[PDB]
Amino acid sequence: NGLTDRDLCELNECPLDPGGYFIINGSEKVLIAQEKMATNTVYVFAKKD
Amino acid sequence: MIIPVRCFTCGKIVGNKWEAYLGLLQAEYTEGDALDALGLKRYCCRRMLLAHVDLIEKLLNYAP
Amino acid sequence: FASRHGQKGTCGIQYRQEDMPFTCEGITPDIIINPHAIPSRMTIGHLIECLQGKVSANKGEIGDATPFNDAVNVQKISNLLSDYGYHLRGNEVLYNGFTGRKITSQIFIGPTYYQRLKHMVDDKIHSRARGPIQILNRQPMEGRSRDGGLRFGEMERDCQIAHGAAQFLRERLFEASDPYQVHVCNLCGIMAIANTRTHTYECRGCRNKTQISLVRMPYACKLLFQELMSMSIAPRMMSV
Amino acid sequence: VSLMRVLSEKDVDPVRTTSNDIVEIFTVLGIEAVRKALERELYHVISFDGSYVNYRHLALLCDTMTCRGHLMAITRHGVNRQDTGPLMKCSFEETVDVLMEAAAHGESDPMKGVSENIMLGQLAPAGTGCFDLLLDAEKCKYGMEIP
Amino acid sequence: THCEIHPSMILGVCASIIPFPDHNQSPRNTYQSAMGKQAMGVYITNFHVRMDTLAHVLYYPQKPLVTTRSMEYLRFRELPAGINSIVAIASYTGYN
Amino acid sequence: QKRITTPYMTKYERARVLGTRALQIAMCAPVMVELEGETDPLLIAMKELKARKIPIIIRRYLPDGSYEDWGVDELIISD
Amino acid sequence: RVRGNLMGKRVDFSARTVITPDPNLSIDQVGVPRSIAANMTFAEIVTPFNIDRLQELVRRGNSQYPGAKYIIRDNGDRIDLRFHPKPSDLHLQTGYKVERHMCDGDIVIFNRQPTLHKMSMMGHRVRILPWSTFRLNLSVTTPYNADFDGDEMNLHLPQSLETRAEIQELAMVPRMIVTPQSNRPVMGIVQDTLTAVRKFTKRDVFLERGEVMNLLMFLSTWDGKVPQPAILKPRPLWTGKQIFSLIIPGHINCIRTHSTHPDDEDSGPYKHISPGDTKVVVENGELIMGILCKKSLGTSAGSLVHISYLEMGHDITRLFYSNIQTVINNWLLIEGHTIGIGDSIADSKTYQDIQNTIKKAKQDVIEVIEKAHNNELEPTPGNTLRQTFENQVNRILNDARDKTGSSAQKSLSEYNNFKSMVVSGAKGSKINISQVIAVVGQQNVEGKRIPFGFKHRTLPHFIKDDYGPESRGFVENSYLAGLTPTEFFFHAMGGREGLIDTAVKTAETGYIQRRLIKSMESVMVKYDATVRNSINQVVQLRYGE
Amino acid sequence: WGDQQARAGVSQVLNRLTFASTLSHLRRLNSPIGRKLAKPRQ
Amino acid sequence: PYANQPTVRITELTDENVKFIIENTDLAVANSIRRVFIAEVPIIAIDWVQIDANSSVLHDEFIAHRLGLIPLTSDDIVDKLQYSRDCTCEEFCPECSVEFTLDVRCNEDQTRHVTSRDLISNSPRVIPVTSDDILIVKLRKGQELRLRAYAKKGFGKEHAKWNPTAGVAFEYDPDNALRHTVYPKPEEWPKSEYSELDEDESQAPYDPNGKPERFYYNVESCGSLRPETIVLSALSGLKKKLSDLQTQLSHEIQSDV
Amino acid sequence: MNAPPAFESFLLFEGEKKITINKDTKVPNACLFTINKEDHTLGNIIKSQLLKDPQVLFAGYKVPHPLEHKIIIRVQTTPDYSPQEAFTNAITDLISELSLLEERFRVAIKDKQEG
Amino acid sequence: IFHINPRLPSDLHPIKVVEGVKELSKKLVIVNGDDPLSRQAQENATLLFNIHLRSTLCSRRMAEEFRLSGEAFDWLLGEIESKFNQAIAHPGEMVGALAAQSLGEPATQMTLNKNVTLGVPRLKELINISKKPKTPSLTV
Amino acid sequence: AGILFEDIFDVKDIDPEGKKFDRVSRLHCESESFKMDLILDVNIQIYPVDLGDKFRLVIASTLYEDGTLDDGEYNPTDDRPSRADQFEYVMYGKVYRIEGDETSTEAATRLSAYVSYGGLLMRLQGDANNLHGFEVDSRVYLLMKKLA
RNA sequence: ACACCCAGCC
Numbered sequence A: 001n002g003l004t005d006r007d008l009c010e011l012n013e014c015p016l017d018p019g020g021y022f023i024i025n026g027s028e029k030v031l032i033a034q035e036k037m038a039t040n041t042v043y044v045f046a047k048k049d
Numbered sequence B: 001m002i003i004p005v006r007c008f009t010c011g012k013i014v015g016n017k018w019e020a021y022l023g024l025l026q027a028e029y030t031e032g033d034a035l036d037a038l039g040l041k042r043y044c045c046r047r048m049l050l051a052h053v054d055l056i057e058k059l060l061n062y063a064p
Numbered sequence C: 001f002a003s004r005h006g007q008k009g010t011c012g013i014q015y016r017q018e019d020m021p022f023t024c025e026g027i028t029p030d031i032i033i034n035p036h037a038i039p040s041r042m043t044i045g046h047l048i049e050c051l052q053g054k055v056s057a058n059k060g061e062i063g064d065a066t067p068f069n070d071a072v073n074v075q076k077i078s079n080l081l082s083d084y085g086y087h088l089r090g091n092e093v094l095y096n097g098f099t100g101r102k103i104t105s106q107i108f109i110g111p112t113y114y115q116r117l118k119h120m121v122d123d124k125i126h127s128r129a130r131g132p133i134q135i136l137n138r139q140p141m142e143g144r145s146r147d148g149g150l151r152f153g154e155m156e157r158d159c160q161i162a163h164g165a166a167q168f169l170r171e172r173l174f175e176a177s178d179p180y181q182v183h184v185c186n187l188c189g190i191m192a193i194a195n196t197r198t199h200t201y202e203c204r205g206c207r208n209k210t211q212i213s214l215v216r217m218p219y220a221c222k223l224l225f226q227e228l229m230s231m232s233i234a235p236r237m238m239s240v
Numbered sequence D: 001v002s003l004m005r006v007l008s009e010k011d012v013d014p015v016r017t018t019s020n021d022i023v024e025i026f027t028v029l030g031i032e033a034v035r036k037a038l039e040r041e042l043y044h045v046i047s048f049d050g051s052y053v054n055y056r057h058l059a060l061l062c063d064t065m066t067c068r069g070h071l072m073a074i075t076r077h078g079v080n081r082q083d084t085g086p087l088m089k090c091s092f093e094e095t096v097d098v099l100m101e102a103a104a105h106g107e108s109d110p111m112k113g114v115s116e117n118i119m120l121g122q123l124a125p126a127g128t129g130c131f132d133l134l135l136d137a138e139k140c141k142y143g144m145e146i147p
Numbered sequence E: 001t002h003c004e005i006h007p008s009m010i011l012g013v014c015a016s017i018i019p020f021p022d023h024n025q026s027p028r029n030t031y032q033s034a035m036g037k038q039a040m041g042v043y044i045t046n047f048h049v050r051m052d053t054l055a056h057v058l059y060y061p062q063k064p065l066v067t068t069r070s071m072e073y074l075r076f077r078e079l080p081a082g083i084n085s086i087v088a089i090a091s092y093t094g095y096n
Numbered sequence F: 001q002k003r004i005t006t007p008y009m010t011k012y013e014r015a016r017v018l019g020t021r022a023l024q025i026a027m028c029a030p031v032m033v034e035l036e037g038e039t040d041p042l043l044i045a046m047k048e049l050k051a052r053k054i055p056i057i058i059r060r061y062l063p064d065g066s067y068e069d070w071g072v073d074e075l076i077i078s079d
Numbered sequence G: 001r002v003r004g005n006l007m008g009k010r011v012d013f014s015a016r017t018v019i020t021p022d023p024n025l026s027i028d029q030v031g032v033p034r035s036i037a038a039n040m041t042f043a044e045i046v047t048p049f050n051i052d053r054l055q056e057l058v059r060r061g062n063s064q065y066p067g068a069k070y071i072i073r074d075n076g077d078r079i080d081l082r083f084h085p086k087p088s089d090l091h092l093q094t095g096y097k098v099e100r101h102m103c104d105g106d107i108v109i110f111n112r113q114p115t116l117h118k119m120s121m122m123g124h125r126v127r128i129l130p131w132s133t134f135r136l137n138l139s140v141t142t143p144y145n146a147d148f149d150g151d152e153m154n155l156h157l158p159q160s161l162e163t164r165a166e167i168q169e170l171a172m173v174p175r176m177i178v179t180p181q182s183n184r185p186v187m188g189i190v191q192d193t194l195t196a197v198r199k200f201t202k203r204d205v206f207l208e209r210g211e212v213m214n215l216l217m218f219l220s221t222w223d224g225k226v227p228q229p230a231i232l233k234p235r236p237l238w239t240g241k242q243i244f245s246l247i248i249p250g251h252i253n254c255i256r257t258h259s260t261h262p263d264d265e266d267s268g269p270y271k272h273i274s275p276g277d278t279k280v281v282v283e284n285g286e287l288i289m290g291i292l293c294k295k296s297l298g299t300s301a302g303s304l305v306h307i308s309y310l311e312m313g314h315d316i317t318r319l320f321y322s323n324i325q326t327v328i329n330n331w332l333l334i335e336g337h338t339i340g341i342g343d344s345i346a347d348s349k350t351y352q353d354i355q356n357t358i359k360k361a362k363q364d365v366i367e368v369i370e371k372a373h374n375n376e377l378e379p380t381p382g383n384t385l386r387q388t389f390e391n392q393v394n395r396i397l398n399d400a401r402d403k404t405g406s407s408a409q410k411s412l413s414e415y416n417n418f419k420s421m422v423v424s425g426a427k428g429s430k431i432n433i434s435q436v437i438a439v440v441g442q443q444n445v446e447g448k449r450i451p452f453g454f455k456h457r458t459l460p461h462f463i464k465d466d467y468g469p470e471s472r473g474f475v476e477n478s479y480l481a482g483l484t485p486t487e488f489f490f491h492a493m494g495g496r497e498g499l500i501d502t503a504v505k506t507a508e509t510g511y512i513q514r515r516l517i518k519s520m521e522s523v524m525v526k527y528d529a530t531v532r533n534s535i536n537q538v539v540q541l542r543y544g545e
Numbered sequence H: 001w002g003d004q005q006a007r008a009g010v011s012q013v014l015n016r017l018t019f020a021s022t023l024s025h026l027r028r029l030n031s032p033i034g035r036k037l038a039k040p041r042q
Numbered sequence I: 001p002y003a004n005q006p007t008v009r010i011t012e013l014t015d016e017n018v019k020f021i022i023e024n025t026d027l028a029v030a031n032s033i034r035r036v037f038i039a040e041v042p043i044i045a046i047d048w049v050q051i052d053a054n055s056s057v058l059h060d061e062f063i064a065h066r067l068g069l070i071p072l073t074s075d076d077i078v079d080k081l082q083y084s085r086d087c088t089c090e091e092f093c094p095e096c097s098v099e100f101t102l103d104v105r106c107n108e109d110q111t112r113h114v115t116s117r118d119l120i121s122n123s124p125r126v127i128p129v130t131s132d133d134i135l136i137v138k139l140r141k142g143q144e145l146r147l148r149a150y151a152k153k154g155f156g157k158e159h160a161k162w163n164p165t166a167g168v169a170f171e172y173d174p175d176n177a178l179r180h181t182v183y184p185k186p187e188e189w190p191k192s193e194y195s196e197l198d199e200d201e202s203q204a205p206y207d208p209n210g211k212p213e214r215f216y217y218n219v220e221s222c223g224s225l226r227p228e229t230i231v232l233s234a235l236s237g238l239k240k241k242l243s244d245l246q247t248q249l250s251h252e253i254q255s256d257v
Numbered sequence J: 001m002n003a004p005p006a007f008e009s010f011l012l013f014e015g016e017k018k019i020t021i022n023k024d025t026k027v028p029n030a031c032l033f034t035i036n037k038e039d040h041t042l043g044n045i046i047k048s049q050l051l052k053d054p055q056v057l058f059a060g061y062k063v064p065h066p067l068e069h070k071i072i073i074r075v076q077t078t079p080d081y082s083p084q085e086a087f088t089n090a091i092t093d094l095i096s097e098l099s100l101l102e103e104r105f106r107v108a109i110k111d112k113q114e115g
Numbered sequence K: 001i002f003h004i005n006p007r008l009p010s011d012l013h014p015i016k017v018v019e020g021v022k023e024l025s026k027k028l029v030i031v032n033g034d035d036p037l038s039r040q041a042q043e044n045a046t047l048l049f050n051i052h053l054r055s056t057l058c059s060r061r062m063a064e065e066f067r068l069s070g071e072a073f074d075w076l077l078g079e080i081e082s083k084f085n086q087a088i089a090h091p092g093e094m095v096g097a098l099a100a101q102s103l104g105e106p107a108t109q110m111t112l113n114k115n116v117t118l119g120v121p122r123l124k125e126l127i128n129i130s131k132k133p134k135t136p137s138l139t140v
Numbered sequence L: 001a002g003i004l005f006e007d008i009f010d011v012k013d014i015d016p017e018g019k020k021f022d023r024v025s026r027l028h029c030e031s032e033s034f035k036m037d038l039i040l041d042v043n044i045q046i047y048p049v050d051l052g053d054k055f056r057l058v059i060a061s062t063l064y065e066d067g068t069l070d071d072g073e074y075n076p077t078d079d080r081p082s083r084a085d086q087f088e089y090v091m092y093g094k095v096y097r098i099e100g101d102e103t104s105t106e107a108a109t110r111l112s113a114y115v116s117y118g119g120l121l122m123r124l125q126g127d128a129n130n131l132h133g134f135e136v137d138s139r140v141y142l143l144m145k146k147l148a
Numbered sequence M: 001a002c003a004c005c006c007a008g009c010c
């Protein structure tokens, strides 16, 4: 979190690594944002079928 | 990662000019004049030495 | 190899420096792309990048190419280029490498950022001649990483039908993939029990021991008929 | 489309009045009429962008869909309802249903088609396989024989 | 009531490396945006410590000679993914 | 017998006949024509077809139930 | 099982790799890497009159190339040659089979996916070449629908002599020059060769003696006699048409028209002496006037390739293809072709004309908007007032785009390379030149203009209720001038629509095609010349009537 | 995404071919529309 | 006997490049001389690297590649050194190769620059040309690079490492008297540095009965050879190739009769 | 994988010959000199030198494939002059040219260095 | 081929042209036979080509426009016969698959969308029944 | 001596429709002896011409002044004194079409001879009495020299 | 195997 660039290098981690991913069984797993319809809002659609 | 020994296009030696180029830049020389003072006339060598990134400097931060 | 404007391309041939064209200054191109990639696709930004790269390399300054900059247009880049002793539109007189004759049409040449893609041929080339065969079908495996065979699909099958090359179609779909032999009873049409070592052929169900026919077929067809029998469907193999 | 009403109206040409619809032509005019109309409509689709396809291919398609008196769709509901062998139909689509129907009714596949022979690995009757070759003993006897 | 900080910030990470994107046919820009993800440079500085199942490292990456002001924040200057090439658009021997 | 099929020999018939004769030649069959040093079975079969000397009878199956025997020699070669 | 492992199944003796160009091969040849050739094998039957060659191949073994991988005895045992050092079993007898590495001249079916039409699986002759890619002549790229941007292609090697014979006699590339789909040559001259042969056959192309005998080296069907020069004094000079006359085979006769042929020239006094050299006349096998382009050398009915195929068979047309490609490429070494920024810039007068046209068009659109805003726009019959207004705006903007394009192309010099590729037909179109030079034009989504995605606005930057050209997606800038952000976004919308259509229509069209195939996979012409299906029901009493 | 009728592909192996590729993958959005329906693709 | 009578005038001659002019010569001969400059002048370059220890951030093949591209002085020894293929030794020997040794270990705090000056060679006549120096690799404390290399003799047709030139600027007919290149707008093109026209004129008048006769050269040496020696070796090598071809042709003619 | 060794562009291994002669039957007095392991360097000069010889009617060269290392030089001469003699004379003239150029270059270098 | 001079008078008897065309028409056989049914089918199968042949090899056109000689006319008749007999559909040719491929290959290039449906959607509309159309119309 | 046509022409106009090609120009010329009319495409880089220049056309079927058929092969190593010595612009081509003014009954009275010289075309209109040596598919030479 | 992603070419 608070490590500076030198501390990151000494710890064998790239300073330029953005992070934002988990490490599960050694695999860098990233969660992709999932789109969904907005909740709590009234929506009137055009079912013609 | 490191400066190429030779210009890819013509084959002029530019591996010995990276440190001199950095020193000239630290001497408040503009990039064009720094390249001219190093004898790089053809724009291929100027491309080679102007567009290079010294990634080995960052690679050397990690302990062996 | 791909540029920064969706201009793909595989390396077609590799010429040495003496074979490639060259300017009056001795500069030879590192890459030569066909003009015909430009007009249909209208990657004019590629050409502007080449011009701006020439101006940048000569001037010694990483030139700006932000999308919607109103201060940078083609005319200003051309005027800057003309000050360095080059043609304002970026063309140059190239000399034919093989003969040394001047090329009649002046070539558009300059620095452009190319990038090599992971799709390298050595990770794609693939061949097979009687490799390992999978369990269920006794057909070639799937994938280069198991010496698998290429799939001769439905549309290839129809294309060879249209050719009329029935023998090639048979060789592809029966002989080159999974030949097999079965023994079928003649009275009924069910696969029979053949002991080839003791030379005893019988069809339990008919009490038949002398009327048995040997039929060549793909192993996949045998599998289909065996699954059908397990599904209580009886494909009788009437050979007469 | 109300073709038969519009055709019967006063002061309306009953000769050149056509419809882009295909079912109305079949049910009003005839089977040959819908064949011709289908030909014209397919040609209109293909040659709208300037592309050209030889006439005989359109003729073959139109004849195939109108060979059996009624309009035969290029779908399961039109191809699998022909009198073809069960194996060709099961290779097309609805595979298990066709095989069940054949098993129940005891249909026999006469191996006359192409897919039937491909599945069984026999020489398909298609081009090079639509005939047989025989040895000519008399012609082999005569002439030169180096080895 | 509002003013854009700069219009060029409508593009994504992989479309911001394109120089002069507004002089391109938009399908070309889309394909390039799908292409830079396949270009190989130095994917991370500590590549000699990681053991990934696949990894590609270019010997001599170069920052583009024709830059975009947006890549000063994508760190494309420190981890480039290509080389500036003396490209000549010509029909030489028919092999292109 | 008043054969009704075309007297011309089809492309498919040419392909199959050349293939079969090449296979026969490769299996040490007697070549029916002199050869000036050709060793490829396909070339020998092609030469043996240029002359009307292939010993094969094409049996063309009419649709209904019947067949017709045409000597390769008594067909017009289309090349 | 049926569709996945019976109708189509994985096969042995198949290779796959990337394709790259090679203009030095014939149309019927395919370059094959050394490894691919050394991997797959072809089984030759040992005979008394080829036993020495096969014995040498066996002796060379699998290590060296060309060599053998297996010896199959008459009984059936298979001996592997990389596992047996003793020479006892390497003796060959008649009836033995030797599986040799495929070498030059072996026939191979060469396929690309999707396998759309019949010409997408043609036979080629293998030629062994150093590197690791399949190589194709540029002419065969059109039937395969293949480019060299990473396309991979399959190579099937027929195993027995019968299958090899029929691939040779039915489906080699020279035998498939003319498709039956539309009775036109499916292949043709393309890209560099087409642009350079448009340049070459221009009236003002004169070749010195040295260049002429350099070009004649690449002419395979050359009888060896150098033709009399068109100009004898004050210097021997051959014209381009004079060399192309040597390329043209036999004595074919053909008449065609160049793309730039004026319509009124036929009725004019100079009908048979074209001022523009636009009437292609090949008489007695010699090109005596005109400029060749896609309309006389491409995939068009009645082109020179079609006449060559229908006059001199298939082999001579193959040589014609290869000769055109090699000769024109080696002349292009001298002439050279290019495209640059200078080819996308018009005169200042042209830019002023385009700007004035766009200003007038915008003024007209504002006038129509004002007329409709006061309910002074009478709707056209058969359309609503909104539809009438949209039609008027679209017609005005289309007229503006057409006028700007015409003004752009009026100013292109003969040396412009955009026009060089457009008139030759090699690549590009007049619309592309107009878009690059003058105006990209209107951007359409689902046929209409840019919709009001926001609350009655195309983008937040416009005011509500703005039907003008800029708001609804009329890109008034050219590609050279650069698009402003709003019209950049609208252009992105149009391009996305194109991509969606390309990526969606495949999944409909492939299913339509497959259904059409399986509807009539068995219909064929039987031996009484009738067309019947598998049930012997006559579909047509004669094929095509 | 659920117990061991659930979303799939919510978590993916981070793309480490190029730094631009990593950044692009870390900023991706997915629409659960099936893979038909040209309107959401526009 | 229809051989030409070429003449040479040398304009500039420094330690880096030679700028000369050839008159009364075919275009083909001048072009072939240029191609021989680029690709058929032998020099000595590192071609066999064996690495004992390499703890640097650069893998072994990278170090070998950067070693191969270092130019080595090849003034007079390249003539007396035989190709490794033609030599009778088993693998390598002093008569057909030159031995180099590099042994660097960084134990100081600051970074160590393994440059070309660390390439110690047994033969005193073959050294890296920079003896600022060519950078081979940068080393952090605790990292060592210890390797031994052998330099063969070769020319540019094999690999670009054996290229002695650093851009051969070749020009002929600086003003289009021959119209070998057609300018669509001649006024826009800069004049060549060898041009002989005033400001008003853009290109020379067309010469219908002219051929390429004067060729301007600028052979810039990377450092392996002096530029004059590059040109002399090029001419000698082309002469030797032609003489070998003549010998083979004579043998073939005598065998065919 | 299939990358050829770099030295095959200029080296003859056991089996090939540097030059071969093949009479051309299409026209009288013509030869097809096939030279292995060469390129345009020795093709262009030979063609240009042959073009000067007034008794040489045709003189061209081609490289059948840029990946194959082989050139084919076709020479057709007057009836009273053999093509092989034309080839030998062309090579001799080229050698004389290059010797003279080398000598003059050495003299010019000496003059420039001296002053 | 025969170096026919289009200026000098020709030696081709128009009766020879008539006889030659009539004789050639009997060699271009698509439906061989003798009975009236086969004869009518043969006449119909080559009606258009026979009309074109009689129009092009007309007596006046050959005498005035083309001006071929007797040898040239005989060669022309031989060539027409040879080229026609080479154009007859070979038995065993799978024309069904060929036609399906020929109609399905353009489908890959056509785009989607008074309004009249066209392109791939209309092809779906046509090859199916489609008991409910998309855009019915009547060209009255 | 094989001289099919012989006259002196005045260059009345050059490229009336514009500069169609850079190196080739179309001369519209009119004679005065036989009063003919010659459109002719000539190379300009190797042989310039100006408006109002007199030049002699000696269009002939053979340069060897013996009637021996040349057969149309380049023979630069020929010593016999051909006709291409007294003219400074020699061209070779094929007469590819001959038009006229024929009716159904009357004979030709005004003939046009079209000759293609490897691409450079020429039309020669005049009285039929002069254009008799011209024949379709006949190979001819065109000889030009300017007159001071 | 199986499943799921990603990606290539149309």
Ligand SMILES: [Zn+2]
Pocket (backbone or CB within 6 Å): B007, B008, B009, B010, B011, B012, B042, B043, B044, B045, B046
């Ligand atoms: Zn350089």
Ligand SMILES: [Zn+2]
Pocket (backbone or CB within 6 Å): C185, C186, C187, C188, C189, C190, C203, C205, C206, C208
């Ligand atoms: Zn039984």
Ligand SMILES: [Zn+2]
Pocket (backbone or CB within 6 Å): I084, I087, I088, I089, I090, I091, I092, I093, I094, I095, I096, I097
């Ligand atoms: Zn040694």
